[PDB]
A paper describes a structure:
The 26S proteasome unfolds and degrades hundreds of proteins to maintain proteostasis, regulate cellular processes and generate peptides with second messenger functions. It consists of a 20S core particle (CP) capped by one or two 19S regulatory particles (RPs) that gate access to the CP proteolytic chamber. The redox-active thioredoxin (TRX)-like protein [name] is expressed in many cell types and was proposed as a nearly stoichiometric component of the human 26S proteasome. It uses its C-terminal PITH (proteasome-interacting TRX) domain for binding, while potentially reducing disulfide bonds with its N-terminal TRX domain but how it binds and is regulated remained unclear.
In PSRpt2, [name] and Rpt6 are ATP bound, while the other four subunits are bound to ADP, meaning that one hydrolysis event and one nucleotide exchange occurred during the transition from PSRpt6. [name], Rpt6, Rpt3 and Rpt4 are in contact with the substrate, whereas Rpt5 and Rpt1 are disengaged. Interestingly, Rpt1 is rotated up toward the top of the staircase (at level with [name]), with its pore 1 loop residue Y249 at ~20 Å from the substrate and potentially sequestered by interaction with [name]. Hence, during the transition from PSRpt6 to PSRpt2, [name] and Rpt1 moved together to the top, possibly because of their coupling by the associated Rpn1 subunit. Rpt5 at the bottom of the staircase is disengaged, yet very close to the substrate (~8 Å). Sharpened maps, with better side-chain resolutions, allowed us to model the linker N terminus of Eos and the following 11 C-terminal residues of [name], as they span through the N-ring and [name]+ staircase. Although PSRpt2 is not the most abundant PS, it is the only one showing an unfolding intermediate.
Residue numbers in the entry:
A (entry chain L): 2 to 241
B (entry chain F): 177 to 291, 302 to 439
C (entry chain H): 3 to 234
D (entry chain A): 386 to 419, 426 to 433
E (entry chain E): 342 to 379
F (entry chain M): 3 to 244
G (entry chain J): 2 to 240
H (entry chain I): 4 to 251
């Protein structure tokens, strides 16, 4: 088998690639779609809730780690939850020792340093979770996408998960407006992106979507079926 | 033989430099062999290419066979590694030998092959000492497409055997658009579509993937109820392709 | 039988560990060395022949003393022999520290054999490719022992391991007698070296060491040359 | 289809004109599978 | 490799359309052959 | 092809070469191109950062780290590996400051980080750092130095060198440039134009140019090129590339 | 494949090493335990010593404490190890809580020990099955069976080792409420269950009986012949 | 197959590495011990005495462990030395803790527990050594125990382990009168067994290693048969054999 | 027969450790060559310098280092391995100075570093540092010493030695020179070393392609031959 | 060639799937069916005993166990793996009652149990822990400050709020039935009748006292496991 070079992250392909790292990257394409946008003073996290069956509650994809910083997971539940606990402990340590919120850039830097260790050394499997990171600090909102390859990007928007390319193209097309939106307009663009990644026979219902919004004076709050009702009440109809 | 491959270089798209190299490596010396013997050197007795699977290596071979009206033989690469000890100077020599009488001819090696482990050694020894024992006028040429550049035998990649080397790169963006266009000219597709957007949505896609995109787009254009004149079908086709099966896998957040 | 010649912690279905036998084969390919126990003392000899006379023969020694009365010689790898020398010196000094008495050669051989076998306990570490010859004199009796990579240790009236060890052993059993004297013991050891030496032993080509009631002493090159001239 | 045939044969064995659910259970026990799964799993 | 150098120089000769060879042609041919050797 | 010997970084080949290190070499060669040049009174750095999607903010994946207040950091290869290497280099510099009480010389820092990346090369339970990085500094009593350290662990001193898919091309294009005389002002323009020519537009387009330098012009402090100097360098690149 | 790895699930969700260890018990020797109203008995098939082995140290039935006993089947050395650990834990539990160890607690400890020995590589599972018998200090008859997998179960009368299936069916067809009315009836039941597989009778049979808190005495080789004689007398009585 | 590290189980349930450790003892020197009415002995074969072994020794196969303990070894020399050292260690530890010589059963169980631990877990090759412990206690007088590389053990009155051990033990059980053998009869039986089980028409005293344990006057004395003593014993047996054959 | 060349700790049949010889070949893989010669009271090491382009800083491409103030060193093979080896040697020398209160002799330093290499080659937890070592120095009551260490842990004293791709030919030339039984004064030692390199390479090198280090009894400090002195030596040799 | 990614839990498939975790998931299909339904009046848990021998003591087979008086459990998978999971659940419940002196919600219970799970691929296992995924699926039901609550735990460590979830050898069929027979305001009595109907429809053997263990939790009473007579009363209606 010519693919004996993908069994652990400690071997390089003869073409200079770590195939296991690439597999971890592709693992988050198996999770549900999720997009996030940012204005002058507000960052939003809207994720497509998925349910194992219609008889059970939908899987939560927006996780609150601190009042000023919140994350959205897309990938393996175990690694996403472990990373969430690590961020919560890091933020608590920061609040205890420095009495200031951890800057989002520093938090994502620590995330990358933590998830690089499985990438480099034998043992722990690489963290196969794509994370959308949205918070507030001195330089305004940021949205950070932590790839499973321990690489992260500072992005105006991003979509990770299943059928995320359509949402990414939607954000590229509507690029020219995201900066100057208020809460409603940016939430609307995010919901339109999530509708774009959603197929025709499905639509963004209250149980299907979850919204997480952070801002200058508004803490990172997660919204649910009743709480997303006002945000969907102004929604335009699907352009079908 | 498939003697009529029916190509006019309008089938291959995005490989302009590659086909120019192929022409200048095979047919240009074929017709100016006189200018070659004026230099007192021998013409290249075989071209080589390499690249990711599905990037059009076989299509360019067929195109060259069409433009030169030369006999085509689709010798396999992984098939030869099996068939016991004997797939050296019993099939390779068989492939070369009687091709030289219906000889407007272009014999064609394909996916890389391995260029206990002793059968492949014999295969490549037969290859080198049979291709090196070539024809003076070189009325029959070899084109030796592969799949990777990782495994290379210097005895083959030297001059004579396989010196003319053509890299097949992944279609970038506009090459993706060109492939989409080429594979969609036989369907009654309206100008309402936007091939450029589909091209910028074809990242990581490689050649035959775009052909599958076109085919699936047509299939769902039928699925929508034979609703001809549609681009949304091209969009959904770009989403599904090889990954059309949707896992629905649990324990993923 | 192949799948069991790769680990030190797996028994071959028929016999025993094969890596031990392979280390012993490495031992058999080393420089020839002999050791002879005389009535009053013990002598051990080995050849220092190496190409490129550029090599400084005085720099390294194949015959080293463990304590005032114990000497050792190897047949196999050099660096493993050096490590064995260091370990044996450490064990001898520990025994001296705890008992305040020079270490009897038998106890030293047991401890050094345990040290060599402790490298055969687990995989990931290889057994020493070196077989030792231990010479010693205590309790009015000269002792000669051989330590093995397997950790087995046994005594020897007169033996010769390394390259061409079988012919050396045949010669020794055809020559050795229990009533031998120290000088004739050295002569026999030198002749045993000579018969397979291939290149006319010089004063420095061979290295010998003697041990008796007066402790163990590696012979200086002058005495080696004198013994060679006497043997001729 | 072989399981159904074996259920029919099992019904024939007891000389019954109608095959019962027990016959199908025994037929699927015979054909399919051509304590371990009952003592550690539960 | 050296015969390859010579043949590749002959090939270089017709890239710039000569009926002969030049010294810089031999240099670039041996350079390409050396890179292929690597 | 070296099959059977390249599965670990502690196994040699019959030719006597560790193929994992060569595969890290190849990984670096298949990455973006970054160059650095050491002027009369300092060093400057240049990176061809490819913006993979317009969705990314400008300055995302900052490839020019600053290990110490006076030490530059230009990397190429894997961004995660590069960040880990920058972090361990920062830790090493901080430890040197805490133990010795003064700034770490660039040669000593390069030696220590090369020792570390080598220590990650000869094990079997770990994998060599698949990134090549640059080190630059300027000291009034020591001078200016530049160092390139690759996954092989080697740390040679280069007058001004490049790493990436445009290794040889940038070597040829930097050879004709005479280097030893001018200062940062008359070398930033050159770095910009070299980076703008080595980059290929027909394939692998959509790149942005970022520069950093250290020297007495900034009081021996590594920092990004100021916006005005960055834009005048871009204008020089545009006029020179015509 | 999926067989040579203790902590690897097969595609059909089987830990095949654990099942192989479980099956290694079937290669042992038959041991049946029955609990009655006031008695619990341990019947095992004793291997016939050829000419020289000392039966005093071929112990198959061993007492963990004064209130618990057990018979194993499947591997003598692993059995000895688990026996020593079980008595050490019984003494430690009596040290911690000062009351005698109930059968449930010691059975749970044995099962947990075997489990923790079958959850990591480099630790071969304990290839024995144990039949824990005894009375709690309140005086209740409890019998437990521990599996090499690390699980335990409550049985009124179970058999382990080779031929355990046949003895199981025998007990299913012959375990009745009146069959345990008296101690002699339980003894008759367990002897009949043993003779179902070890048909020679007399020798090759070892019985240990536990009444209410008496420090059980294993039936010595003077009444086992008497008990089998009574069994034969009843056997010719009903037929 | 399932012949990997010892911590593996064959589908049929066999521990193949342990089985190979079992069968490996057949390559070791033959040693046997017999229980007599008023004494016990260990008879062992010196399989390797070529010409030039110093014989600076008390016994190679037989190893004394305690003032009441002695055993014979059969297996790899390294594991032999390690097991003997551990035997001495545990015996002296019991003596220190309890101020009493360790019982044979307790010491044998300790060593067998160690051996089982070497095959239970850890990825370590089991000790390929089989032992024959000889000793006395107030609990059971004279006892003989035969160890096992698997970590098992058994109380025996007559047992042979090593090469040709099967035939030796078969004829021994065919020719053992339990409860009516003294030291002299046991010695003669051991000599006859070694004669029938070794590949020599006339075995020499050098190839034979015999140690006798006897309790007398309050204390237990462990002595190996001296060269003169063993020579006298073998010559007495050869004249007994000559008498038997001339009578036949 | 074969297949035993995978692990350093595996003994092949006929007792041959392949991986050690593979490291020995990795020594030649460096592509360079060095020689060392010892006189009555001097010891000269000289190594070849290859510079692919003027772009490198020639002052930092040195292949010979300084272990202590009076003990020099030169190595060939994998250069990163060489730098790790000199770092370990410096550590060992200073630690010896601390522990025993006097400068480390060349023989003992080579012995200890060879012990380190043997420990590396004994356990399968290391790659055995595939770079050769050559040390020179002066010891009282003995004079100059030249000592060579290899990844196998083998060390020996040399009247004159070599390392690199041209090991065999350089050793043969040194044999031819040594069998003439000549005193080898300092200038003539340097001359013989330079002639050895030139004949074994057949290049008649320019003075800029060589670095030389010498240790003498009158100058126990390990002095690296600067450009002026090497120019003098080799131009005088060319004219002589 | 899925085999190279089969061995070991720390290996990623080309599709990014954790194959060993998937096998642990499928190992649930070897456990007896367990059905739990969420109602406003409480939650009921019904299981299949799968009695191997009539001689076996039924009380030993613990398909339903008590983590705390306010919470119930149902299990399907390896008995050993569960036993450890149940012990950890009880220990964590008592830890919460010690530190905060309050009855911890069933969501936090399943959170902690999942925390013990999903730890197979972690370096904290040096003192000793599971190097393989837990092969038991957990059905948690009880009453808390949010009223009655039912949670199903996935061997990978995933938990979800389920109004009616069925696990075991017959998860698919029982879940499909519960899909159409479940209704939001369904009363506890009719919920238990529905659960027993599904179990009868899906059981291999007939329905009796010894084939099912039944548990119920309602806001008023504590955890109650249906005794023999209660089982007869609830099974005579069906
Ligand atoms: N540039 C291109 N233009 C049009 N079609 C292409 C192009 N590249 C690949 N294809 C399609 O891919 C297929 C050929 O794949 P190819 O790479 O030649 O096969 P292989 O990789 O197996 O040798 C053809 O169906 C062809 O239509």
């Amino acid at each position: 088998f010519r693919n004996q070079y993908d069994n652990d992250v400690t071997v390089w392909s003869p073409q200079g690639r770590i195939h296991q790292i690439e597999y971890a990257m592709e693992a988050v394409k198996q999770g549900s779609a999720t997009v996030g946008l940012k204005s002058k003073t507000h960052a939003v996290l809207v994720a497509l809730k998925r349910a194992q069956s219609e008889l059970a509650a939908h899987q939560k994809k927006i996780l609150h780690v601190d009042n000023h910083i919140g994350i959205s997971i897309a990938g393996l539940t175990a690694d996403a939850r472990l990373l969430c606990n690590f961020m919560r402990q890091e933020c608590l340590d920061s609040r205890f020792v420095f009495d200031r919120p951890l800057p989002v850039s520093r938090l994502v830097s620590l995330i990358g340093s933590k998830t690089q260790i499985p990438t480099q050394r034998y043992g722990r499997r690489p963290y196969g979770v794509g994370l959308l990171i949205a918070g507030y600090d001195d330089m305004g909102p940021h949205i950070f996408q932590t790839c499973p390859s321990a690489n992260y990007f500072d992005c105006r928007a991003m979509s990770i998960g299943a059928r995320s390319q359509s949402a990414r193209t939607y954000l590229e097309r509507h690029m020219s407006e995201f900066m100057e939106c208020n809460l409603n307009e940016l939430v609307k663009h995010g919901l339109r992106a999530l509708r774009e990644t959603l197929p025709a026979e499905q639509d963004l219902t209250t149980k299907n979507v979850s919204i997480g919004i952070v801002g200058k004076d508004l803490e990172f709050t997660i919204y649910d079926d009743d709480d997303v009702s006002p945000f969907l009440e102004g929604l335009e109809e699907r352009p079908q | 033989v498939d003697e009529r491959p029916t190509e006019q270089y309008s089938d291959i798209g995005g490989l302009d430099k590659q086909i120019q190299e192929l022409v200048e490596a095979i047919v240009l010396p074929m017709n100016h062999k006189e200018k070659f013997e004026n230099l007192g050197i021998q013409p290249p007795k075989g071209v080589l290419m390499y690249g990711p699977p599905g990037t059009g290596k076989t299509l360019l071979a067929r195109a060259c066979a069409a433009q030169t009206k030369a006999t085509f033989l689709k010798l396999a690469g992984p098939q030869l590694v099996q068939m016991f000890i004997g797939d050296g100077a019993k099939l390779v020599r068989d492939a070369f030998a009687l091709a030289k009488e219906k000889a407007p001819s272009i014999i064609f090696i394909d996916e890389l092959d391995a260029i206990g482990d002793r059968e492949v050694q014999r295969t490549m020894l037969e290859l080198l000492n049979q291709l090196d024992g070539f024809q003076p006028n070189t009325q029959v040429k070899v084109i030796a497409a592969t799949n990777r550049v990782d495994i290379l035998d210097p005895a083959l990649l030297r001059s004579g055997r396989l010196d003319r080397k053509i890299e097949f790169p992944m279609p970038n963006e506009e090459a993706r658009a060109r492939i989409m266009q080429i594979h969609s000219r036989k369907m009654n597709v309206s100008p309402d579509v936007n091939y450029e957007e589909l091209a910028r949505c074809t990242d990581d896609f490689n050649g035959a993937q775009c052909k599958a995109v076109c085919v699936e787009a047509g299939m769902i254009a039928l699925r929508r109820g034979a609703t001809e004149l549609t681009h949304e079908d091209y969009m959904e086709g770009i989403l599904e392709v090889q990954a059309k099966k949707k896992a629905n896998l649990q324990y993923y957040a | 039988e192949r799948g069991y010649s790769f680990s030190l912690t797996t028994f071959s279905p028929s016999g025993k560990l094969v890596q031990i036998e392979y280390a012993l084969a490495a031992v058999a390919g080393g420089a020839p060395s002999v050791g002879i126990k005389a009535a009053n003392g013990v002598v051990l000899a080995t050849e220092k022949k190496q190409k490129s006379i550029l090599y400084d023969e005085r720099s390294v020694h194949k015959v080293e003393p463990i304590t005032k009365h114990i000497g050792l010689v190897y047949s196999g790898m050099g660096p493993d022999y050096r490590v064995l020398v260091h370990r044996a010196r450490k064990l001898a000094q520990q025994y001296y520290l705890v008992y305040q008495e020079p270490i009897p050669t038998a106890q030293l051989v047991q401890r050094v054999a345990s040290v060599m076998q402790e490298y055969t306990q687990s995989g990931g570490v290889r057994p020493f490719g070196v077989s030792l010859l231990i010479c010693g004199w205590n309790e009015g009796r000269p002792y000669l022992f051989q330590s093995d990579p397997s950790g087995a240790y046994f005594a020897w009236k007169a033996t010769a391991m390394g390259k061409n060890y079988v012919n050396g052993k045949t010669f020794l059993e055809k020559r050795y007698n229990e009533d031998l004297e120290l000088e004739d013991a050295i002569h026999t050891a030198i002749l045993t070296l000579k018969e397979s030496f291939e290149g006319q032993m010089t004063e420095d080509n061979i290295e010998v060491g003697i041990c008796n009631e007066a402790g163990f002493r590696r012979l200086t090159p002058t005495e080696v040359k004198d013994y060679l001239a006497a043997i001729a | 289809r072989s399981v159904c045939t074996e259920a029919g044969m099992f019904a024939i064995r007891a000389r019954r004109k109608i095959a019962t659910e027990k016959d199908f259970l025994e037929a699927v026990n015979k054909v399919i599978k051509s304590t371990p799964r009952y003592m550690t799993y539960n | 490799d050296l015969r390859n150098v010579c043949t590749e120089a002959g090939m270089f000769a017709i890239r710039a359309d000569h009926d002969f060879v030049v010294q810089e042609d031999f240099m670039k041919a041996v350079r390409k052959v050396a890179d292929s050797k690597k | 092809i070296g099959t059977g010997y390249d599965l670990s970084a502690s196994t040699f080949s019959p030719d006597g070469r560790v193929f994992q290190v060569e595969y890290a070499m190849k990984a670096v060669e298949n990455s973006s191109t970054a160059i650095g040049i050491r002027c009369k009174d300092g060093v400057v750095f240049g990176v061809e950062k490819l913006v993979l999607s317009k969705l990314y903010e400008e300055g995302s994946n900052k490839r020019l780290f600053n290990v110490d207040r006076h030490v530059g950091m230009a990397v190429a290869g894997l961004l995660a590996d590069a960040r880990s290497l920058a972090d361990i280099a920062r830790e090493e510099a901080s430890n040197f400051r805490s133990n010795f009480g003064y700034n770490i010389p660039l040669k000593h820092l390069a030696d220590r980080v090369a020792m570390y990346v080598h220590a990650y090369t000869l094990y079997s339970a770990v994998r060599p750092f698949g990134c090549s990085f640059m080190l630059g500094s300027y000291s009034v009593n020591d001078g200016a130095q530049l160092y390139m350290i690759d996954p092989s662990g080697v740390s040679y001193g280069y007058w001004g060198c490049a790493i990436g898919k445009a290794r040889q091309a940038a070597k040829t294009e930097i050879e004709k440039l005479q280097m030893k005389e001018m200062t940062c002002r008359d070398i930033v323009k050159e770095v910009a134009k070299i980076i703008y020519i080595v980059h290929d537009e027909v394939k692998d387009k959509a790149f942005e140019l970022e520069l950093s330098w250290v020297g007495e012009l900034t009081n021996g402090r590594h920092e990004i090129v100021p916006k005005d100097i960055r834009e005048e360098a871009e204008k020089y690149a545009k006029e020179s590339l015509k | 494949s999926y067989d040579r790895a203790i902590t690897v699930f097969s595609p059909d969700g089987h830990l095949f090493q654990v099942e192989y260890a479980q099956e290694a018990v079937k290669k042992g020797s038959t041991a049946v335990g029955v609990r009655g109203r006031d008695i619990v008995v341990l019947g095992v098939e004793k291997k016939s010593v050829a000419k020289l082995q000392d039966e005093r140290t071929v112990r198959k039935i061993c007492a963990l404490d004064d209130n618990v006993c057990m018979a194993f089947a499947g591997l003598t050395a692993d059995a000895r190890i688990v026996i020593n650990r079980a008595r050490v834990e019984c003494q430690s539990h009596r040290l911690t809580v000062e009351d005698p160890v109930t059968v449930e607690y010691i059975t749970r400890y044995i099962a947990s020990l075997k489990q923790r020995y079958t959850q990591s590589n480099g630790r071969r599972p304990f290839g024995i099955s144990a039949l824990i018998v005894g009375f709690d200090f309140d005086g209740t008859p409890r019998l437990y069976q521990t599996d090499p997998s690390g699980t335990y179960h409550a049985w009124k009368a179970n058999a382990i080792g080779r031929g355990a299936k046949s003895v199981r069916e025998f007990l299913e067809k012959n375990y009745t409420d009146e069959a345990i009315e008296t101690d002699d009836l339980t003894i008759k039941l367990v002897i009949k269950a043993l003779l179902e597989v070890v048909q020679s009778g007399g020798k090759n049979i070892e019985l240990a009986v536990m009444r209410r808190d008496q420090s059980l005495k294993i039936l010595n080789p003077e009444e086992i012949e008497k008990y089998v004689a009574e069994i034969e007398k009843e056997k010719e009585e009903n037929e | 197959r399932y012949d990997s590290r010892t911590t593996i189980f064959s589908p049929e349930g066999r521990l193949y590495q342990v089985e190979y450790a079992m069968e490996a003892i057949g390559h070791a020197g033959t040693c046997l011990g017999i229980l007599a009415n008023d004494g016990v002995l260990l008879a062992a074969e010196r399989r390797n005495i070529h010409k030039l072994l110093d014989e600076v020794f008390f016994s190679e196969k037989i190893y004394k462990l305690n003032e009441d303990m002695a055993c014979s070894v059969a297996g790899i020399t390294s594991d032999a030395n390690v097991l003997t050292n551990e035997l001495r260690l545990i015996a002296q530890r019991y003596l220190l803790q309890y101020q009493e010589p360790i019982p044979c059963e307790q010491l044998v169980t300790a060593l067998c527990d160690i051996k089982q631990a070497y095959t239970q877990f850890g990825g370590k090759r089991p000790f390929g050594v089989s032992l024959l412990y000889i000793g006395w206690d107030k609990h059971y007088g004279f006892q003989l125990y035969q160890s096992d590389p698997s970590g098992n053990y058994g109380g025996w009155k007559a047992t042979c382990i090593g090469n040709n051990s099967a035939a030796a033990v078969s004829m021994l059980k065919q020719d053992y009168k339990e409860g009516e053998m003294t030291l002299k009869s046991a010695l003669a039986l051991a000599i006859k067994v070694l004669n029938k089980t070794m590949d020599v028409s006339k075995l020499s005293a050098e190839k034979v290693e015999i140690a006798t344990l006897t309790r007398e006057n309050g204390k237990t004395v462990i002595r190996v048969l001296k060269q003169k003593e063993v020579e006298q014993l073998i010559k007495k047996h050869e004249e007994e054999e000559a008498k038997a054959e001339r009578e036949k | 027969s074969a297949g035993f060349d995978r692990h350093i700790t595996i003994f092949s049949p006929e007792g041959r450790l392949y991986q050690v010889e593979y490291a020995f070949k990795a020594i030649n893989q460096g592509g360079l060559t060095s020689v060392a010669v010892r006189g009555k009271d001097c010891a000269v090491i000289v190594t070849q310098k290859k510079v692919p382009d003027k772009l490198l800083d020639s002052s930092t491409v040195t292949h010979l280092f300084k272990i202590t103030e009076n003990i020099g060193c030169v190595m060939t093979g994998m250069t990163a391995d060489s730098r790790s080896q000199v770092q370990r040697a410096r550590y060992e020398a200073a630690n010896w100075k601390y522990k025993y209160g006097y400068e480390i002799p060349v023989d003992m330093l080579c012995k200890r570093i060879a012990d380190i290499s043997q420990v590396y080659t004994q356990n399968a937890e290391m790659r055995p540092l595939g770079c050769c070592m050559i040390l020179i120095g002066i010891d009282e009551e003995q004079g100059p010493q030249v000592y060579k260490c290899d990844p196998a842990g083998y060390y020996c004293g040399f009247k004159a030695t070599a390392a690199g791709v041209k090991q065999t030919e350089s050793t043969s030339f040194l044999e031819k020179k040594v069998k003439k039984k000549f005193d080898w004064t300092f200038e003539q030692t340097v001359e013989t070393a330079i002639t050895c390199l030139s004949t074994v390479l057949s290049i008649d090198f320019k003075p800029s392609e060589i670095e030389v280090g010498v240790v003498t009894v009158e100058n126990p400090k390990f002095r690296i031959l600067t450009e002026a002195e090497i120019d003098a030596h080799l131009v005088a040799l060319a004219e002589r | 060639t899925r085999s190279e990614y089969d061995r070991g839990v720390n290996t990623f498939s080309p599709e990014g799937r954790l194959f060993q975790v998937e096998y642990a998931i499928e190992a649930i299909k070897l456990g007896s069916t367990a059905i739990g339904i969420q109602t406003s009046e409480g939650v009921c848990l019904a299981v299949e005993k799968r009695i191997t021998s009539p001689l076996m003591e039924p009380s030993s087979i613990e398909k339903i166990v008590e983590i705390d008086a306010h919470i119930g459990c149902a299990m399907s998978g390896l008995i050993a793996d569960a036993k450890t999971l149940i012990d950890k659940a009880r220990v964590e419940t008592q830890n919460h009652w010690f530190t905060y002196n309050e009855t911890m919600t069933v969501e936090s219970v399943t959170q902690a149990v999942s925390n013990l799970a999903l730890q197979f691929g972690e370096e904290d296992a040096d003192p000793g822990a599971m190097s393989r995924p837990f092969g038991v699926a957990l059905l948690f039901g009880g009453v808390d400050e949010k009223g009655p609550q039912l949670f199903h735990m996935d061997p990978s460590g995933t938990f979800v709020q389920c109004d009616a979830r069925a696990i075991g050898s017959a998860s698919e069929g029982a879940q499909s039935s519960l899909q159409e027979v479940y209704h939001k305001s369904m009363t506890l009595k009719e919920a238990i009748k529905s659960s027993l109907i599904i179990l009868k429809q899906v059981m291999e053997e007939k329905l009796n006292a010894t084939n099912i263990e039944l548990a119920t939790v309602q806001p008023g009473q504590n955890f109650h496991m249906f005794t023999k007579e209660e089982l007869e009363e609830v099974i005579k209606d069906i």
